[PDB]
Amino acid sequence: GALTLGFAQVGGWRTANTESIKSAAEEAGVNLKFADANGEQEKQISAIRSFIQQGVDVIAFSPVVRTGWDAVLQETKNAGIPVILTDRAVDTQDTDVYKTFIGADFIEEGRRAGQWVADQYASATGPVNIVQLEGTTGADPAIDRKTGFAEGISKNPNLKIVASQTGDFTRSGGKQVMEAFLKSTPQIDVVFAQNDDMGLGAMEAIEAAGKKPGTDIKIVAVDATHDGMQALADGKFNYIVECNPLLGPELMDLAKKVAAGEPVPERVVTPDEAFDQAQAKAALPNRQYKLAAALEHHHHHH
Ligand SMILES: [Zn+2]
Ligand SMILES: [Zn+2]
Ligand SMILES: [Zn+2]
Ligand SMILES: [Zn+2]
Ligand SMILES: [Zn+2]
Ligand SMILES: [Zn+2]
Ligand SMILES: [Zn+2]
Ligand SMILES: [Zn+2]
Ligand SMILES: [Zn+2]
Ligand SMILES: [Zn+2]
């Protein structure tokens, strides 16, 4: 009587990865059945139907698209199998077709980035000119991080976004746009980079212009990646924020709750990360050791 969890993976932006889900199920004693939709909704819908046929206790999936799940979700509800959504939220026209959604909040990321700018410059004695390197036009995290950042700086009107342009989430995109900003904007105090790569690009443009990233022009970015954190530890970025994807254990814990009929909230929040330079300098070199210790304990499951 191990709980059986069917999980239909996609094949996106802040997505729980397979190793995390597989390892968390081993740790929780959950019998995990994986399916791969290969980017395609009809194949995810088939995987869900096959889990219903296999009589799993709980079905979770990471929706490849927001819409068009109501029919298959009626089939799960009719089979009495609870459903948990991960990573991407759905649009539904029905009531109570899934138990809970677990995923990252991109508006919150932008907001925390904005709020750090507001905090750091609460006493600025001159205007604070912010330039923004946006993600790919129309991408959900790009739209939301922009919305969030605007909210985070909204209580201090000395903070002004004086230029905002897509760098398409890439290093070369961020570098190219920052060059343009340096040409068009005589006074830049802060860059808000909606991901680490664009921030790293920007840092190189700032350096090529003979300026000092992190001191002359401060950089606040999203994504606590190795290279982002390395820049921050080197004092070339000033602040990083991240809203995590699903980690794994909370999914396993929720799966147990919903299989037992315990009511759960319709949304469960993921954890967050944030680092200034001092915090990155402590955390970064250590990560390899914490990772290795954890992998060692876990390998006894294999
Ligand atoms: Zn494992
Ligand atoms: Zn264990
Ligand atoms: Zn309907
Ligand atoms: Zn969104
Ligand atoms: Zn990256
Ligand atoms: Zn968060
Ligand atoms: Zn600190
Ligand atoms: Zn151990
Ligand atoms: Zn051991
Ligand atoms: Zn192993």
Side-chain angles (χ1 to χ4, degrees):
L3 193 278
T4 297
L5 174 61
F7 188 82
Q9 310 169 107
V10 192
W13 299 119
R14 204 67 100 201
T15 303
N17 65 73
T18 298
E19 68 269 18
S20 296
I21 292 174
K22 176 172 168 315
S23 65
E26 289 165 347
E27 298 328 59
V30 171
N31 175 27
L32 179 68
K33 300 202 93 84
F34 266 128
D36 185 17
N38 249 231
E40 266 163 19
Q41 184 178 49
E42 305 270 73
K43 193 134 174 210
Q44 202 154 45
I45 288 167
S46 297
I48 291 162
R49 293 184 164 142
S50 162
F51 295 146
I52 294 168
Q53 290 319 286
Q54 296 167 59
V56 303
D57 299 308
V58 185
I59 282 165
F61 67 109
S62 178
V64 49
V65 294
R66 290 185 79 78
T67 313
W69 306 102
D70 285 358
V72 79
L73 291 180
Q74 288 294 323
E75 296 161 31
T76 54
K77 167 179 220 282
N78 293 342
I81 300 175
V83 174
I84 299 182
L85 301 178
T86 66
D87 312 301
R88 178 200 305 283
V90 297
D91 287 347
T92 182
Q93 316 291 317
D94 291 350
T95 48
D96 297 341
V97 277
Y98 63 90
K99 291 313 197 190
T100 198
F101 166 63
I102 316 163
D105 192 341
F106 302 131
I107 295 176
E108 173 238 282
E109 290 177 320
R111 185 162 176 181
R112 295 157 54 214
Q115 181 61 57
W116 174 91
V117 177
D119 291 350
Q120 295 300 121
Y121 286 97
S123 301
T125 62
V128 181
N129 289 344
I130 300 166
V131 302
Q132 179 165 190
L133 299 171
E134 307 170 19
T136 299
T137 304
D140 173 55
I143 291 179
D144 283 353
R145 287 175 189 158
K146 178 167 180 155
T147 295
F149 188 83
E151 299 174 356
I153 66 167
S154 68
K155 280 164 69 78
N156 178 357
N158 291 337
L159 307 196
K160 263 152 170 177
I161 298 165
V162 295
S164 197
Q165 181 168 333
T166 185
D168 273 313
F169 287 134
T170 72
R171 187 180 198 116
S172 73
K175 182 181 190 165
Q176 168 169 322
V177 171
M178 191 68 202
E179 287 158 16
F181 286 167
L182 288 160
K183 276 163 196 143
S184 79
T185 306
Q187 150 74 341
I188 301 172
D189 300 293
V190 180
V191 3
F192 169 48
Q194 288 183 3
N195 83 336
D196 67 328
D197 296 319
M198 291 191 300
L200 298 159
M203 175 192 94
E204 290 178 17
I206 292 165
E207 283 171 333
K211 286 150 182 293
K212 225 202 138 183
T215 316
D216 295 330
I217 296 178
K218 293 197 177 347
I219 296 174
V220 53
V222 183
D223 296 335
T225 63
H226 206 107
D227 291 348
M229 301 270 290
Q230 185 62 56
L232 179 57
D234 297 347
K236 300 194 174 184
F237 281 17
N238 304 83
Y239 198 66
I240 287 169
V241 297
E242 184 181 315
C243 184
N244 290 158
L246 169 156
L247 293 190
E250 80 286 77
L251 172 56
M252 302 306 147
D253 178 61
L254 291 156
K256 289 175 179 168
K257 289 181 175 173
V258 299
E262 178 185 336
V264 301
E266 279 168 335
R267 183 165 161 229
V268 168
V269 296
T270 54
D272 293 331
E273 300 178 48
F275 298 95
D276 60 13
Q277 167 185 46
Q279 293 170 290
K281 202 177 275 155
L284 215 218
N286 184 241
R287 292 282 178 75
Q288 61 198 321
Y289 300 105
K290 285 178 131 69
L291 172 67
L295 289 178
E296 183 282 319
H297 313 309
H298 173 73
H299 175 70
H300 297 288
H301 291 269
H302 297 158

